[PDB]
């Protein structure tokens, strides 16, 4: 059975810099265990109907994994523009799979300030659809950075920084991207 | 020790052309996605065209699209916008404009040339003026869209004094550059951003400018002027 509940069920979540992603294989797939996983602040597929998810068999099923503010949900989606779109998780423009998001204030918001949770800032060229880019190089503005990350010097992650009186807008929300890649492959991926 | 250097200027008759420069120096040029921003009469600031660092990727503003070209030359370290078909509507001061940081999608331009006087002859929402008395606190507007200010958290303000280009005193919503003192605070609710002024010094007797990213590659301005009451 595909382990769809233990993206969903985690105990944290990746910075979206970093995200996660869990390849799913050879295994029996019940989409119903997704709704079982609290209501969904998004729920919002892409070439496919999430109400026929068990009639279909796929090669592939990709489960990524990542944690951004709420208004930046609207930048996990194909074709997107923007801080998190460019520089933290592109979509590509023919995608087909779902994303789903949800309000995690109760687990990822602190009252000191959760650092942890990173997205990049800036980055000279935009992510190739899927792709992830774990540096940390600081940047120099200024015709010399070494480990100094000063006024020209800029270091490229910040912080969420996330505390539970922040509006809805920026509390936490835990997504899972799912895409179902289709190929000539024996699909391995099916209903029961 | 940037510096951003434009040229071309010309009084022109519509139908006419015309192609500004720009040089750069002061950083690795090679990096930057740079912009082109006029300052038409009356009507303030007007973003209007934007190229990536290596030329592969342009965009324009609706009023420009398909009469303007931008275009670059990094091995001179150089940005220029031709122009054609001009009109009326063009007549402004033409600036040559990088941002804070390097990506396409950067929101928030510190560095900004003098301006190049465009003259062609045979929206977000703002304050005209307002007015504080030293020591109190104003606040100012600038009302967008769902697509502009609402869409996005990168609002920025830009304050300019008589005969100096933009200085960009609030990014990205809430954040301050070096420098830019705390008595000048950014928020934003819904579609209205706005920024406050406190401890209220004459030497902010200036005028502001809000922008917002404004979705696919592209940028939106306003105008208003604070005059401190002496």
């Known amino acids: 059975l595909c382990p769809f509940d233990e993206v969903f069920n985690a105990t944290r979540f990746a910075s979206v810099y970093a995200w996660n992603r869990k390849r799913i294989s050879n295994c029996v797939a019940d989409y119903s265990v997704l709704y079982n996983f609290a209501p969904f602040f998004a729920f919002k597929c892409y070439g496919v109907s999430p109400t026929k998810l068990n009639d279909l068999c796929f090669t592939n099923v990709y489960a990524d994994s990542f944690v951004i503010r709420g208004n930046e949900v609207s930048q996990i989606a194909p074709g997107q523009t923007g801080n998190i779109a460019d520089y933290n998780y592109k979509l590509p423009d023919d995608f087909t799979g779902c994303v789903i998001a949800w309000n995690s204030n109760k687990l990822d918001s602190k009252v000191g300030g959760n650092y942890n949770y990173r997205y990049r800032l800036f980055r000279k060229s935009n992510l190739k659809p899927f792709e992830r880019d774990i540096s940390t190089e600081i940047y120099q503005a200024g015709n010399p950075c070494n480990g100094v990350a000063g006024v020209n010097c800029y270091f490229p992650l910040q912080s969420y920084g996330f505390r539970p009186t922040y509006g809805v807008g920026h509390q936490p929300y835990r997504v899972v991207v799912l895409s179902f890649e289709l190929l000539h492959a024996p699909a391995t991926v099916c209903g029961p | 020790e940037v510096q951003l250097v434009e040229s071309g200027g010309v009084v022109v008759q519509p139908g006419g052309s015309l192609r500004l420069s720009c040089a750069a120096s002061?950083?690795?040029?090679?990096?930057?996605?740079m912009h082109w921003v006029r300052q038409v009469p009356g009507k303030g600031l007007e973003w209007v065209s934007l190229?990536?660092?290596?030329?592969?990727?342009?965009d324009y503003a609706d009023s420009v699209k398909g009469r303007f070209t931008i275009s670059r030359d990094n091995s001179k370290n150089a940005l220029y916008l031709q122009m054609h078909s001009l009109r009326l509507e063009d007549t402004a001061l033409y600036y040559c404009?990088?941002?804070?940081?390097?990506?396409?999608?950067?929101?928030?331009?510190?560095?900004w040339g003098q301006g190049t006087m465009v003259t062609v002859s045979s929206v977000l929402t703002q304050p005209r003026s307002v007015s504080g008395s030293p020591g109190q606190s104003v606040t100012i507007s600038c009302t967008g869209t769902?697509?502009?200010?609402?869409?996005?958290?990168?609002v920025s303000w830009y304050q300019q004094h008589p005969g100096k280009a933009p200085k960009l005193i609030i990014y990205?919503?809430?954040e301050r550059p070096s420098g830019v003192p705390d008595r000048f605070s950014g928020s934003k609710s819904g579609n209205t951003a706005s920024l406050t002024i406190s401890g209220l010094q004459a030497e902010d007797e200036a005028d502001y400018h809000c922008?917002?990213?404004?979705?696919?590659?592209?940028?939106?301005f306003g105008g208003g002027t604070t005059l401190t009451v002496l």
């Open positions: 404009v990088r941002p804070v940081y390097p990506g396409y999608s950067s929101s928030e331009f510190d560095s």
């Open positions: 002061g950083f690795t040029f090679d990096d930057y996605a």
């Open positions: 190229i990536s660092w290596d030329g592969g990727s342009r």
């Open positions: 769902i697509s502009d200010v609402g869409a996005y958290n990168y």
């Open positions: 990205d919503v809430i």
């Open positions: 922008c917002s990213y404004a979705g696919n590659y592209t940028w939106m």
